[PDB]
């Protein structure tokens, strides 16, 4: 049991919350996204979806800022809320200190955001995980957000549907993308390979890929259309 569901304020006999465990599933039910990075670049590749052939596809990249941006995997209504607070904290950093925000610092602010609802009576654990990419004074970084709120630095990771396969790819090719530096193309082309492994009963399509890369000398940029058709 499984009756201790419908409460986020009741610890189960094992000290887990069902609301958070069910939220990990919630991610899986959304779209796949792969993050990967070096010291010179950070990239998100995300699977777009259509539910009818009269759709022009739906983007899964939200621009946070002109050095940062983020992806979603899991519930889309949960996601929209999280990205609003996140945008705010980058605006603050610029305004008051004339500073740009670090990936890690932003993620510690989002880490807090989650836990407000988890303590209280009513509210939800979030059901979507974000991979945050940005470039600061400490280079490229890549963070993974959880329902719990837990934040983990990884040189490359994947969330979403059948994403365990993309992580296996990344694990094999671990050193390859850390060693690649100064080539934005090459981090992008590796990204294509990883998300191929994720796709089941499907293949890579141009109108499916959305690619976002931010770098040392590169501002945040979202490629789509006829700009991902040379990375097909």
């Amino acid at each position: 049991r499984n009756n201790y569901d419908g409460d986020t304020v009741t610890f189960s006999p094992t000290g887990r919350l069902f609301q958070v465990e069910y939220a990990l599933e919630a991610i899986k039910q959304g779209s796949v996204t792969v993050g990967l990075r070096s010291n010179t670049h950070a990239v998100l590749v995300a699977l777009k979806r259509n539910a009818d052939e009269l759709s022009s596809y739906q983007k899964k990249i939200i621009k946070c800022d002109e050095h940062m941006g983020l992806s979603l995997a899991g519930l889309a209504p949960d996601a929209r809320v999280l990205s609003n607070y996140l945008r705010q904290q980058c605006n603050y950093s610029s305004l008051v200190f004339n500073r740009k925000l670090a990936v890690e610092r932003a993620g510690h602010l989002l880490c807090d955001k989650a836990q407000k609802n988890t303590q209280s009576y009513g509210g939800r654990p979030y059901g979507v995980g974000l991979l945050i990419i940005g470039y600061d004074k400490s280079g490229a970084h890549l963070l993974e957000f959880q329902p719990s709120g837990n934040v983990t630095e990884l040189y490359g990771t994947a969330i979403g549907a059948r994403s365990q396969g993309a992580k296996t790819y990344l694990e094999r090719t671990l050193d390859t993308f850390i060693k690649i530096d100064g080539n934005p193309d090459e981090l992008i082309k590796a990204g294509v390979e990883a998300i191929s492994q994720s796709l089941r009963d499907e293949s890579l399509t141009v109108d499916n890929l959305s690619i976002a890369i931010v770098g040392k000398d590169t501002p945040f940029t979202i490629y789509d259309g006829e700009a991902v058709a040379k990375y097909i």
Binding site: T10, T14, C111, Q146, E153, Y155
Partner: protein, 244 residues
């Protein structure tokens, strides 16, 4: 069982709150975290498990700082563990402004334990699910506490929490018997490491990472700072030597 949980502030005919005890059950499942009191400092050591080779180690810590002199390390659920240190950080900051002197280490134990307590007092909000070992060096010297998610805190010479807590306390038990003084600061770095080696024979599936931090009177200058380099290598060689 059934009855008098569902809420964390409903007693039973045995006087015991069930939900809260499951709070302690959450702390067991988290990682092996230990802290050692010395007569001139305190040393904090942690098992941060390596969950992949795609993880980036020694860049995600369960060490956090409070003021610039109080070390903290947590067991339990990781982001709950963030949240309670955050509270610590607001009190540190506020106290330092009003009285213009740092937070005393006994003063700190009292204040934290009370926020934990406002959340075990209401039926409506959940309790914390983390323990926090903490302490440092202040004007009244070194002092070390471990705060339970139950609402309780005590002084300790050596405090342990997490899964491998049965093994770590057994090693600490030698440390108190053998040195009544709590051991010198320098040897307690290499010691803090040894215990975590012998306590990861109960989380042996995965790989681990040892990160060490300390606060010592004449060697970290009454302030908290990370242990790195040659010192770190030595804590590793020492532990290694004696597990073998």
């Amino acid at each position: 069982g059934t009855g008098y949980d569902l809420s964390n502030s409903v007693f039973s005919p045995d006087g015991r709150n069930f939900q809260v005890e499951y709070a302690v059950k959450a702390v067991e499942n988290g990682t092996t975290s230990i802290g050692i009191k010395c007569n001139d400092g305190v040393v904090f050591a942690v098992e941060k498990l390596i969950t992949s080779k795609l993880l980036v180690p020694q860049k995600n810590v369960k060490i956090q700082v409070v003021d610039r002199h109080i070390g903290c390390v947590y067991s339990g659920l990781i982001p709950d563990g963030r949240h309670l240190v955050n509270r610590g950080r607001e009190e540190a900051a506020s106290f330092k402004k009003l009285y213009k002197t740092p937070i005393p280490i006994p003063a700190f134990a009292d204040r934290l334990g009370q926020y934990v307590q406002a959340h075990t007092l209401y039926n409506s909000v959940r309790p914390f699910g983390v323990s926090t070992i903490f302490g440092g060096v202040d004007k009244n010297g070194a002092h070390l506490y471990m705060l339970e998610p139950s609402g309780s805190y005590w002084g300790y010479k050596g405090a342990a929490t997490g899964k491998g807590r049965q093994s770590a306390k057994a090693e600490l038990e030698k440390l108190v018997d053998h040195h009544p003084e709590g051991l010198s600061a320098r040897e307690a770095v290499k010691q803090a490491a040894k215990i975590i080696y012998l306590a990861h024979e109960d989380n042996k599936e995965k790989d681990f990472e040892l990160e060490i931090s300390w606060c010592s009177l004449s060697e970290t200058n009454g302030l908290h700072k990370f242990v790195k380099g040659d010192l770190l290598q030595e804590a590793i060689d020492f532990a290694q030597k004696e597990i073998n």
